Amino acid sequence: MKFAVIGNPISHSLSPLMHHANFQSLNLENTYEAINVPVNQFQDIKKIISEKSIDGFNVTIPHKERIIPYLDDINEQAKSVGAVNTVLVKDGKWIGYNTDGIGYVNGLKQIYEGIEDAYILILGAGGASKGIANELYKIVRPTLTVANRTMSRFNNWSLNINKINLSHAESHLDEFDIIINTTPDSVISLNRLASHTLVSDIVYNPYKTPILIEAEQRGNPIYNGLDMFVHQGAESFKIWTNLEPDIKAMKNIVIQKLKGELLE
């Protein structure tokens, strides 16, 4: 089978390396290639992919929205956030998925015990926040809390959650078991942060953002966006292939790369 990641630029994507470690562990004779697609060529995307007999592809910057008009259908997770990160080519029809939110949550489930009973705060009200809230809503009992500096950007949220501002988040911070930052200086004061709270950021470059550094200094466990990147790709793989990805091999190769412990 033939897979790809499309984006512009594309050469920094760690997707081809990660996906290749999964192919190796599972003895699959597949390709996964970085495909450079300038915006000025993007109207020809169907020809660009079809010509290479690609069975499925990930979508990164700047095409997660741009891709949508070119799809034959699109799932609810993807319509909900207004972005596609995963395309399935099935009998030449293009079907859109979004594995970012579910990838985050699937990672978080394996390091946090008892997520069903967690009180969860999410910082930021954008697409990445909405995708994660979408998946958490399905499995978390205590109602979700989302904090943004402006309350207006919750205007397109259908989801029924607690909407708070940042200073309220800061003063009630000890009420939360998990804090999930999705905002691009620690974004919130951590002066009222309880000792047990998992502090998390969807970013893994840098490997610790300022929120994660300040939290870890107070002794809190911290959790960056590395698991989210592996699980999002693993989920795309499950859509494309119906096989079970090797999470450990996929994570371990990205760690090796970031450590500069791979040779070329």
Side-chain angles (χ1 to χ4, degrees):
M1 292 184 75
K2 296 186 75 178
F3 306 108
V5 63
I6 70 158
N8 191 66
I10 201 53
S11 75
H12 278 5
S13 182
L14 297 192
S15 274
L17 170 81
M18 184 172 68
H19 279 95
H20 282 98
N22 184 49
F23 297 156
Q24 294 192 116
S25 168
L26 291 177
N27 313 298
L28 306 171
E29 305 179 358
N30 289 327
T31 53
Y32 188 119
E33 306 175 277
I35 299 185
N36 185 44
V37 186
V39 167
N40 55 106
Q41 303 199 152
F42 196 86
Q43 67 285 344
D44 300 327
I45 191 60
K46 293 194 95 311
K47 189 171 305 165
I48 298 173
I49 296 293
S50 291
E51 277 181 334
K52 7 256 214 237
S53 291
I54 286 146
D55 299 305
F57 55 95
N58 288 128
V59 186
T60 189
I61 296 166
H63 307 317
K64 320 220 298 193
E65 302 86 30
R66 203 181 318 271
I67 187 74
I68 296 174
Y70 295 86
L71 305 172
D72 296 296
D73 203 348
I74 176 178
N75 80 352
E76 287 298 304
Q77 299 156 272
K79 282 196 168 116
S80 179
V81 309
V84 160
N85 88 323
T86 299
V87 177
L88 173 65
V89 177
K90 182 71 180 194
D91 302 312
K93 296 287 132 157
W94 283 24
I95 315 305
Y97 303 83
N98 193 315
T99 64
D100 286 324
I102 184 62
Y104 180 81
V105 173
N106 278 0
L108 180 59
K109 275 152 52 164
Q110 332 301 329
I111 49 71
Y112 185 87
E113 218 76 80
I115 200 165
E116 164 174 294
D117 301 306
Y119 292 84
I120 301 182
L121 175 61
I122 314 176
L123 316 166
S129 170
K130 194 193 290 179
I132 294 173
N134 279 345
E135 301 301 336
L136 287 178
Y137 193 82
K138 295 165 192 144
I139 57 140
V140 180
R141 301 173 71 99
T143 118
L144 294 170
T145 307
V146 184
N148 197 63
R149 193 155 66 263
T150 47
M151 292 292 303
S152 68
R153 62 178 141 214
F154 294 120
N155 250 247
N156 38 69
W157 278 61
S158 344
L159 209 63
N160 222 267
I161 45 102
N162 310 315
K163 290 157 190 184
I164 67 171
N165 65 8
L166 293 180
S167 50
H168 194 279
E170 277 161 344
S171 31
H172 296 251
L173 196 57
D174 67 294
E175 303 171 10
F176 303 101
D177 306 309
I178 314 172
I179 298 170
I180 310 166
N181 184 36
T182 70
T183 75
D185 187 43
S186 180
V187 43
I188 53 157
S189 174
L190 305 171
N191 295 339
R192 304 177 180 109
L193 172 78
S195 295
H196 73 289
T197 313
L198 186 58
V199 190
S200 186
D201 195 308
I202 59 166
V203 175
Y204 70 95
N205 170 20
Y207 210 73
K208 300 179 185 169
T209 49
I211 199 178
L212 297 199
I213 300 179
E214 318 255 47
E216 176 170 60
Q217 161 144 290
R218 295 172 64 87
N220 287 248
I222 59 151
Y223 190 49
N224 72 17
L226 174 58
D227 269 359
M228 176 192 193
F229 175 64
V230 344
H231 281 268
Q232 71 74 38
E235 289 304 313
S236 303
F237 178 80
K238 292 163 62 211
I239 294 153
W240 293 325
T241 70
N242 330 125
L243 298 174
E244 200 53 47
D246 186 340
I247 302 301
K248 197 174 63 79
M250 293 164 83
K251 194 178 188 165
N252 287 354
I253 202 70
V254 172
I255 288 155
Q256 296 195 246
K257 169 77 180 188
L258 297 164
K259 278 175 159 163
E261 305 201 319
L262 291 175
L263 315 185
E264 83 154 354

